[PDB]
Amino acid sequence: AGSQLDTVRRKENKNVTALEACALQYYFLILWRILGILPPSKTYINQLSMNSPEMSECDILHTLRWSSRLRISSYVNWIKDHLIKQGMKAEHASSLLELASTTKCSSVKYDVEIVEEYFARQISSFCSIDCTTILQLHEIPSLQSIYTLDAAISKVQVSLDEHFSKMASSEITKNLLPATLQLIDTYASFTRAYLLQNFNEEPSKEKLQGFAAVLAIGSSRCKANTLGPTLVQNLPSSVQTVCESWNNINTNEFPNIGSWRNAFANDTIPSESYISAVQAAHLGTLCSQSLPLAASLKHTLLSLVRLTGDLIVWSDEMNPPQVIRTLLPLLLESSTESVAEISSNSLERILGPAESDEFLARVYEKLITGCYNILANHADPNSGLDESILEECLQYLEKQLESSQARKAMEEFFSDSGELVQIMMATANENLSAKFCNRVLKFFTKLFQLTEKSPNPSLLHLCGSLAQLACVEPVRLQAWLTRMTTSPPKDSDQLDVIQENRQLLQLLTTYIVRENSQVGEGVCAVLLGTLTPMATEMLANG
């Protein structure tokens, strides 16, 4: 009851009033007590023994509650005596209770599999969800699914901890890792969707994706990124304030690690009380009018990453690089910065120390990929990205050239995708400032010079990359050459900067024509031929 009210009022772009939020909390807290004091009925004990239905109609939690109860005999007794009163045959009762008890490791498995199936359900429901694309603010799940999934983790986790300490299963975690892994990435998109779409219009999906890419590149956790935070600040003050409000929100309301370990002031099974406190914190976020749904997503995602790290601890069947890929953006992003610390821990686990090459290798590679994405797929002003961002990382890109390790990482990506060419091809965009042209020219200038001052294969490979420039759109290349040479004082009041652009283009041509250059002869001719019409025009129009 009242589970889709938030989905509805948020669908109508309306904040659930405190009265309504409070009512939802009041209602859930009451029915939860009632379900708890009322003895489990025969049909439902049979279900706990059969479970043919997927319990889609809000029965997943109740089940865990009663299983935890049954684990304890007092409850076994209480429930079995109620079944005798209920009118169920006494021996039937005994058998059911024994079957529901799943004594031995079967109890741990019973828990594992139920949470596994809830995971599966959630994943499948996510089929409409796009992992690498911006999700509509309606694709975000209701707090119901958020807290239910959060409660599901709150259980598998504790149960497995217990099992492992007792052991002091591999296949049990072998199935949990993949299921959890997908959810994290999916909920990561939900956190972004809740933050991105929240941007105040006073925003175009083009602008929305621009802001998304910028805040992703932005990383303020673990290693001190000197580019992501800068671009995050560069974001419009409005967008910047939205991001600040998102980060201001925390998961402190929800009980943290160790609370159930402290028995949560609860006898028998304290995990049930921990899950109840988690639901109470979810309802408290609902009362708050500040990003309530994802405040819960922020916690659910944290719990998911915690469970993921737990699973990584054991071999399972996890694919090390794949798990690294999932935790990589989680660390390098402002929307999922909540788990950025836990993702860094996961990387220390699989990549190694935060100063280990692998770790740094992934960090910087992803960083370049993002910068590049902003340089080529966010150059258009429609992305709503100020020119400051592109030029800011353009300097960081040169900084990476200086770092031999980062230079090699950039070299591999740039040489394989001809990204260097794309940078000049992007420069063709007339919307980009003449300063962008100037900046681009230095970058390549310093690529060629650094090669001359200190020759190495990475630099040889970027010149092999510029050989791909030989094969570019002739019109686009000319359009780019035109922007570089033609000096209109109407738009470019800084003709001196236009002249610096001309000089740096001359320098790059001289570098490519050098015998030891790896750009090859084809590129030189390509440029030469394209300039011929330009020259002719400089004589035709005088």
Do 183 and 305 form a contact (C-beta atoms < 8 A)?
A: no
Do 323 and 305 form a contact (C-beta atoms < 8 A)?
A: no
Measured distance CA(326)–CA(33) in Å, rounded: 39
Tokens read off for 150:
């959060």
Measured distance CA(415)–CA(100) in Å, rounded: 61
Tell me the DSSP string of 53-114: S--TTTTHHHHHHHHHHHHSHHHHHHHHHHHHHHT--HHHHHHHHHHHH-TTHHHHHHHHHH
Tokens read off for 28:
């859930």
Do 196 and 134 form a contact (C-beta atoms < 8 A)?
A: yes
Tokens read off for 496:
């001196």
Question: Gap positions in the chain, given as the residue before each gap (C–N > 2.5 A)?
Answer: 168, 202
Q: What are phi and psi of 111, to 5 degrees?
A: -70, -50
Question: Torsion over CA of 485, 489, 492 and 494, rounded to 10 degrees?
Answer: 90
Residue labelled with tokens 């100063």: 355
The alpha carbon of residue 502 and the mean position of all alpha carbons in its chain are separated, in whole angstroms, by 42
Sign of CA dihedral 86, 90, 94, 96: negative
Do 393 and 231 form a contact (C-beta atoms < 8 A)?
A: yes
Closest by Cα among 399, 312, 400, 394 to 361: 400
Amino acid in position 299: H
Q: What are phi and psi of 326, to 5 degrees?
A: -65, -40
Measured distance CA(270)–CA(273) in Å, rounded: 5
State the DSSP code for 382: G
Resolution value, angstrom units: 3.4
468 CB-side CA count, 13 A:
16
Method: cryo-EM
Do 251 and 368 form a contact (C-beta atoms < 8 A)?
A: no
